[PDB]
Amino acid sequence: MISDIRKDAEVRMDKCVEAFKTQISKIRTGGGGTEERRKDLTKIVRGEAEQARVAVRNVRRDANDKVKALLKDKEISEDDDRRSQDDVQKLTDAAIKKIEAALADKEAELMQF
Amino acid sequence: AHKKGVGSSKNGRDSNPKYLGVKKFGGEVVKAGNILVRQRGTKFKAGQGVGMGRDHTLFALSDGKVVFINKGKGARFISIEAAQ
RNA sequence: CCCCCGUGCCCAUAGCACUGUGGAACCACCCCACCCCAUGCCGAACUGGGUCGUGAAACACAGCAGCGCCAAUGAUACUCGGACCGCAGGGUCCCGGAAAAGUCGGUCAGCGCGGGGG
RNA sequence: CCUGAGAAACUUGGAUUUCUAACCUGAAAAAUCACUUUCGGGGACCGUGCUUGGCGGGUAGUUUGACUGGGGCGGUCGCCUCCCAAAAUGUAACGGAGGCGCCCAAAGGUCACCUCAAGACGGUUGGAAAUCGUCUGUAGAGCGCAAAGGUAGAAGGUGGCUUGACUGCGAGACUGACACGUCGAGCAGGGAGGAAACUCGGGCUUAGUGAACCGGUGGUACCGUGUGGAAGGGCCAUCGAUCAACGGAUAAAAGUUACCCCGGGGAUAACAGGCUGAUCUCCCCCGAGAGUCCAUAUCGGCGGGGAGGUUUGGCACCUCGAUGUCGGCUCGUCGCAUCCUGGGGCUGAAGAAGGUCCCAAGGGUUGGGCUGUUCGCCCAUUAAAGCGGCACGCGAGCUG
RNA sequence: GCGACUGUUUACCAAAAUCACAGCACUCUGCCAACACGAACAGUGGACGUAUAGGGUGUGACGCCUGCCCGGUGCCGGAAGGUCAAGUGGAGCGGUGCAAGCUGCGAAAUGAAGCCCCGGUGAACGGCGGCCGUAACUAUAACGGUCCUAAGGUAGCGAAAUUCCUUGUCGGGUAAGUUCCGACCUGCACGAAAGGCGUAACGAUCUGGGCGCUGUCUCAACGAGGGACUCGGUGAAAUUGAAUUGGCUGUAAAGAUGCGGCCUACCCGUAGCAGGACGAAAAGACCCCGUGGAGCUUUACUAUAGUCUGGCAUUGGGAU
RNA sequence: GAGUGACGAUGCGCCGAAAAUGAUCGGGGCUCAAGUGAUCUACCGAAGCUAUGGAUUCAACUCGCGAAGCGAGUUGUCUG
RNA sequence: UGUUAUGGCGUGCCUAUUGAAGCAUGAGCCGGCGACUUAGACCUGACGUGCGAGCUUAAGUUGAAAAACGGAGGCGGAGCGAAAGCGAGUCCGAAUAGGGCGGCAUUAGUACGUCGGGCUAGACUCGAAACCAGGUGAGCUAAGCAUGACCAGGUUGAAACCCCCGUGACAGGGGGCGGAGGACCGAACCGGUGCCUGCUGAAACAGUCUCGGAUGAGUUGUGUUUAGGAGUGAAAAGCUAACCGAACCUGGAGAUAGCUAGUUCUCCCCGAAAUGUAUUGAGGUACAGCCUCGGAUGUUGACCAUGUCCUGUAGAGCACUCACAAGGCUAAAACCUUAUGAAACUCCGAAGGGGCACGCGUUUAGUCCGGGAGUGAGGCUGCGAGAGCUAACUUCCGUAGCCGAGAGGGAAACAACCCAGACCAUCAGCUAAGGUCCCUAAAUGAUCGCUCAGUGGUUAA
RNA sequence: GAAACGAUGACUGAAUCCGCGCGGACCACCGCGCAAGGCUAAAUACUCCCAGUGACCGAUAGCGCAUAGUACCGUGAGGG
RNA sequence: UCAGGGAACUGAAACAUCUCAGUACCUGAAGGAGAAGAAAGAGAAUUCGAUUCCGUUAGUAGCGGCGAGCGAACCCGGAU
């Protein structure tokens, strides 16, 4: 059954990450950096990362209840609870790992000029 | 109640005691009513002085000597040579 | 000496397939069929009563090594057992046993009883 | 006799209601009971005694299976098929695939009879399949359902009659540890189908199953506690269990314990060790390609060969009549895959500040905020502010 | 932050965010009360009380408050109807004997409370979701279909400790804050009498910051007194296979003083340190086992105290 | 300018090779090999086999006594 | 002899275990005490005696001195059936098929004894947690009740009370005054916060120093009542005479104890198992397997040969089945050429193996009846497979050897491996493994070369 | 359980000479015996106390004690 | 000894049934002994004859989640 939730989790997750990763490019007007006008712009970037974190947590606090309250109806025993956790972590941690990595490059451009 | 199943699919456990095989071989002095070879299909057909049971059980129709005969696969008859 | 008819053993080193020789005796077709008996429907089969003609066709004998089928010297696989190797995967040495396949070759039969004919 | 009235006999059942010397209950003189007494008040209800069904964890007594590469959740436990093998038999694993808890008023019995899959050429309300026909055809189809054996002289496809899908039996064998279980020639009684020899005691075989007890219902007239019956009992037959945790405690049984207790275990877990090393760490080989040019200055796809054992873990072997568990503080110390220094090579190295790889552990490697942290972020520095061992070094040292 | 407050407790590990409270609420009881102790129609406590009195439950200064859902459960109420106990009572089946007569089986109607069935009752148990979708300055809140059913959160609050997901995201104080205070809201799993939110005063309560001072610290140093040390006097313990009881590297049931090999080492103390003796101390208080045990719970099994109930009595007499 | 250059197969060996209390093939040492492939011989070396002595278990064969029984020789055992 | 120096070799006992010196259990040492019995006219058997048909029970008599009689009962003395019942036969059944028994190799035995064992009782010995009955006390702490006791000092400043303000007046504000308080500070007293000490204490719970309450729901004395599966409980399952989720004491039994530990004199013989099946079973036990003892038998065992039958691991291979390598070719399946894989493919297919009769070099077991057992997870190793990186001194089958219960030599050390299975004694000899420079014995022996790494002393692309 | 008889707690409530109880559901029959009134060593049971014997002990045995239910623990039961 | 009241481990390898048991403990009464004692009895070859006790009958007939396991009485010898 984990092979079913894994997809539904990765698809929806990567679908968002791939989306925001493209939206952040719409913020960059050109060069970025015109006398002090560099940090104030970063404020807009903070929103992209903030909304990203939540989006990655939603799927975790949504797909989990779909299985937790499912294995209680006499269908799936234990030993799968933690198994499902380590499954969403490899997706959540990986996502955040890409976000911070992406922002590291974006910030290097918005401050470059 | 649920919406999945009472048990996990894909099994592979739980076997069965088998058997069959040959009881009496060539050069055996059996008696009337002695099981020769057990089977389920038709590996060894009945010969002269031999009968066939329900589940194909070649038994001794009379006292004699168990002898096997083969013509090269296909069918193997088992005749019994009576003594005296 | 031959040949035909049945019925056996044998159960493809006897099978199929190219072609031929055969109908006098035997053999089949064919002819007819109210009813015995008979077809999911037809008497093609089964079957009753029976010529000539015929023997492409079913059969019967015969030749030809196309294909099937059988198929050994040597030799390798494996290997009981005996003695070892490499971290291991796995591998070898000695004494016997020792097949698949493929090579040569060999065939399309061989052995009876019975009844009918020259 | 048949209907209705009228009656001081009685008069069962029974609803109301009424009264009351029982009974209950209150003031007074010797206000616990008892005399009595005006009484009054309730009431023959209540309460009490026996009994019926109910509600009943308030209390009592118990149950809550097992396997289980620790327990638990889960899954799985009876039967037959293959496969798994040390090659007849047999044989383990929460080892690899699949079926049963039927079905058949007749695919059964007997006797007659019919040459299947599938392709091909040629025709039909057909242009995939079938159907009709003709060639081919070691049968490649079929056999109710699982697989296998069996695989055509048929069990395979049809028809008539039929219903042995029988009672009384079994020489002698298969199999089992026990109890079951399977197969069976021949006997008899009486029958069925062929003309006959004959076949026939369910179904091509293998699953379609359950001891024993307790009781239902037909047959039989063995007991029947003085004799004679009868009640009840016995034997034939057969029915009932989803006893499915299926060789099966009771007629009938779930949880929790961090309030926990006893008997035991390192034939079973967490710490640590150990074996291991998939995962981790790191070294090396190949050169896709980036790197202007160029594969190796640096970086090295795809794939590979080893190393160390500090990580997840697997196995769980000393240790559960006791190997104290994280971290810090204290004390340290050892290895190198060397963070800083020290010498070197190559650079895509001008200098300068670097990179990288090589050699090299003498010695050194700061102070704080947050954090319980190891770890990590940040502050301010520095030659630098290394990684890992040492029972994740150090509690008979401390903290807690 | 928690609770209002003073007050109480886990005599020998926890005094508190416990409990308790004043205050609010639901309910019960008018009788020899509910209720409770009792072998007892004995006695007594409730009360020499008597209903804004008495028991029960929960909740808990005071303030603004106290939403939607009774389907299921329990609670009161109803009531022609469906099932039932003992018993009354009528046809029947059978046994024995000659017969009178004598004995088993079982029976329509009728037979109490309860059960179903209807209503209500949530400051009674309690409930306030699952499947897919996201766009809208500033202002509160999230929609729309598909649903077992009875519903499916109105105010207020929202990382407090309730928010698993990182330190969630801006903000505040700091040189630097995985903390703490404001906010956002995505509340994995807030929330209304298992009460919400708030609140001055109090708390040996918990949390964070600042002021001041300081050997808590950077580093300690010194002084003192009580041991410790020395001699005279008295003289115990846990422990204890036995012992002339090294070091390394290797083995062995995989952590050796005792095995192997190598190396080190005169014999005996006294202070003293704690690495080892898997050092002591409790047959590990964690796990697994034993159809071992025990408390507790419950819509698990079953009696049963108790309490409801028809009949039978101590319980008769009159009128319809 | 009486010699060279390219591989293919094997016997031996070098690099690759980094561990934590001090190191080592058991150690010392060993190439004037005490390393290793093949060849032979001698010796060594178990409580195995052997020798001299003995005891025990089972059998049969000469015994003595009227008997249970004892002791005697023989083979094996004596399995540890 | 006592003692000793030097050499060699030399891992406590025990229990428990696959494996023990073990850093696993047990134990200071000695001493003595300390564990497989007793019983029933019990069952079943081995040895033995007495009869051979065998024998008494209770009791009755002698009653310094002893044994007898007692012949109720009990065991033999056919069986078969469910039973009626019939019988050197009886049930199944109206059949002559079988089961039970008789005859046949013919015991019928019985009673007493000793000894193995079984059953029932404490029933090898030691140990529970717990259960029940009765009883003990609130001189414990929990509380009620009756009656008394106590609270240095200081601070604060309530209502109420006189009076007063611009103002009819009613709510306020001020000064005086009063003394309220689950008020404040605080000693005693009460209770315990925080640190340190103490931790074989001074002490079975405390000291110093802090801290809390200190007219109060306060502290306290005396007397006194509730009880211990019940009381009490400003509620922790707290307390109820110092370990109370059910006191304590005595009895019910020395409860049960399938779990643990221990079980005492010697020698000789044999010699196990850790398998299979069933199990509310999985360390437990039943049946068999395996052991031994004895009675019958007395070569049937055992390996080795020979012929005879059955399998279809290994291999192979294509024309079957599932996948599969390149082209052809066709409107892709098929068919062709070349080429393949395969536990669950197979037309082929061995080794070895298995049943049988048969015998010799052989050989000396085999079996039947019956007594008493233990073991009932087993460990490693090569081989043959599953699991699992064909990873574990991993696990689960098969198989052989060892261990387990076998030492001795060898592999330095080392259950597993190699050589070998130890009756006793020998300052005696030949070997196996393995070695022969020195630490221990034995060629620092020969010949031909390989080496030069010090390889030989954990690895590969 | 077909399960009689006895035995009562609640209810009921015979006969009393051609009577009643019993005899294992019940009936017939045959058979056996008379309750609801009472008393009775003995042969039985035990062992504080005595006397005798003992393949019983002999002072960590035998009762707990060769002289104590004392010393001592306990509030106490009790233990000893 | 009699009477009134009357367990639970434990057994069934659980367990409510039964078992342990009408044992233990408590209580009431009495004595040297008691309980019981002269048959509406057992029971049956139409037998015997107050009560108790011993042996046997019989670990039979029978009871039983008919599992565990419990388990008479008449007749027959005898104390009397």
UniProtKB/Swiss-Prot annotation, chain A:
What is any one of the record's Gene Ontology cellular component terms? cytosol
Q: Write down which residues bear the modification named N6-acetyllysine.
A: 90
Sorted alphabetically, the Gene Ontology BP terms of this entry are: cytoplasmic translational termination; translation
Record keywords, A-Z: Acetylation, Cytoplasm, Protein biosynthesis
Entry-linked InterPro entries: Ribosome_recyc_fac, Ribosome_recyc_fac_dom, RRF_sf
Q: Name one GO molecular function term.
A: ribosomal large subunit binding
Classification via PANTHER family: MITOCHONDRIAL RIBOSOME RECYCLING FACTOR PSEUDO 1, RIBOSOME RECYCLING FACTOR
Could you say which protein family the record assigns here?
Belongs to the RRF family.
Q: What is this protein called?
A: Ribosome-recycling factor
Per the UniProt entry, what species is this protein from, by scientific name? Escherichia coli (strain K12)
The organism that produces this protein has a lineage beginning with: Bacteria, Pseudomonadati, Pseudomonadota, Gammaproteobacteria, Enterobacterales
From Swiss-Prot, chain B:
Q: Origin, by domain of life?
A: Bacteria
- Tell me the keywords, alphabetical order: Ribonucleoprotein, Ribosomal protein, RNA-binding, rRNA-binding, tRNA-binding
SUPFAM superfamilies associated with the record: Ribosomal L27 protein-like (SSF110324)
Q: Which PROSITE patterns match?
A: RIBOSOMAL_L27 (PS00831)
- Gene Ontology CC: one annotated term: cytosolic large ribosomal subunit
Q: Would the keyword Ribosomal protein be found if you checked this record's keyword annotation?
A: yes
**Molecular function, one GO term:** tRNA binding
Gene Ontology terms describing biological process: translation
* One Pfam family in the UniProt entry: Ribosomal_L27
Gene3D superfamilies tied to this protein: 2.40.50.100
Question: What is its biological role?
Answer: Binds the 5S and 23S rRNAs and also the tRNA in the P site.
Task: Share what the entry says about its subunit structure, partners included.
Answer: Part of the 50S ribosomal subunit. Contacts protein L18.
Q: Which NCBIfam families match?
A: L27
Q: What is this protein called?
A: Large ribosomal subunit protein bL27
Q: Which gene encodes it?
A: rpmA
